[PDB]
Amino acid sequence: VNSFSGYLKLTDNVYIKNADIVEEAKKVKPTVVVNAANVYLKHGGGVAGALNKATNNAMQVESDDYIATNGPLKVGGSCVLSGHNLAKHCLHVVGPNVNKGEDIQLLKSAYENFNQHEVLLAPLLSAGIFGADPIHSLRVCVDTVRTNVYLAVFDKNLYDKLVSSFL
Numbered sequence: 820v821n822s823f824s825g826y827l828k829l830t831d832n833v834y835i836k837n838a839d840i841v842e843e844a845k846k847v848k849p850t851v852v853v854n855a856a857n858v859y860l861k862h863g864g865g866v867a868g869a870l871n872k873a874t875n876n877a878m879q880v881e882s883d884d885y886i887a888t889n890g891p892l893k894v895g896g897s898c899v900l901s902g903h904n905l906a907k908h909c910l911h912v913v914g915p916n917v918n919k920g921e922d923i924q925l926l927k928s929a930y931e932n933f934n935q936h937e938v939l940l941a942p943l944l945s946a947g948i949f950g951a952d953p954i955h956s957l958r959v960c961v962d963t964v965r966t967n968v969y970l971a972v973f974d975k976n977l978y979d980k981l982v983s984s985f986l
């Protein structure tokens with residue numbers, strides 16, 4: 820039993836809700852919140868900009884030190900950093916950004932990072948400003964993640980479409 824509330828159950832391990840991931844993280848304080856990161860951990864907009872803003876820019880400060888030490892992530896890769904006031908940990912995961920021409924096949928590799936964590940609160944990878952089809956992202960999530968994932972979808976219209984079209 821966990822503290823996630825109001826989710827629709829899609830499969831044995833995947834759950835979905837129309838929610839602001841920032842507000843959901845602040846309420847649940849999950850062990851792991853997933854960020855929709857880029858390879859430079861520049862949290863300017865989308866989910867990343869919102870999460871970082873909620874940390875009062877502490878996420879960005881920590882991320883800049885991470886990059887200065889380690890260099891950029893790979894597309895499809897991830898790193899574990901602090902969750903600040905939102906979660907114990909933040910798993911920064913880089914899905915391909917279609918608006919940069921990145922290979923959508925890397926979306927499966929991106930979701931594989933979730934399997935290193937027993938339970939996660941997450942957005943749909945490569946959705947929103949990353950330019951991928953969210954219906955496809957949900958399909959890849961369900962077919963790749965085996966651990967327990969609680970998906971927050973900000974847009975109510977998109978949420979209803981994701982549920983109604985789910986196979």
Ligand SMILES: O=C1[C@H](Nc2ncnc3[nH]c4cc(F)ccc4c23)CCN1CCF
Nearest residue numbers: 839840865866869942946947971972973974
């Ligand atoms: O709403 C969503 C889903 N992403 C989110 N899910 C949960 N919380 C979120 N907070 C955000 C804050 C932002 F500035 C930008 C995006 C999100 C977001 C996936 C695609 N989509 C439609 C429009 F992008």
